[PDB]
Design a protein around this nucleic acid. Sequence first.
DNA 1: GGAAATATTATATTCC
DNA 2: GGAATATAATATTTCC
Lengths: 55, 56
Amino acid sequence: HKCKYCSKVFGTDSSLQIHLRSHTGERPFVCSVCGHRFTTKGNLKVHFHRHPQVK
Amino acid sequence: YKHKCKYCSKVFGTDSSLQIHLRSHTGERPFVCSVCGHRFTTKGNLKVHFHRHPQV
DNA sequence: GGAAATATTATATTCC
DNA sequence: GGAATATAATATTTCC
Ligand SMILES: [Zn+2]
Ligand SMILES: [Zn+2]
Ligand SMILES: [Zn+2]
Ligand SMILES: [Zn+2]
């Protein structure tokens, strides 16, 4: 499960290529109101709670 | 800039950003939690952590 | 201009 | 075991 780029290795594959996105620049999670893109869903979840809501 | 870390020699824009960075070497965690005793290297990191403790 | 806060990003660690 | 939550470091933005 080792990073082909930085010689780091994790216990899971899911953790492995969340890490890869820090190398390849892939950012699959996108904010509906803003267009800014993130590497993980939790990040965008944090960044989303900064846009004022409307419900 | 003029402010360089004496451990990793990465330069920082302003001395106050350097003193926070040095805490990532010394392990000095000044800011402590009122409810749970967990110590944090910055006031901000303590804020995002404190704001989940249900109610005081 | 510089300190402080806020937003950001990567990852370890719980959760499910 | 993947997904969520917490976390730590720093880049960006706000305030002064
Ligand atoms: Zn890597
Ligand atoms: Zn947005
Ligand atoms: Zn350093
Ligand atoms: Zn606490």
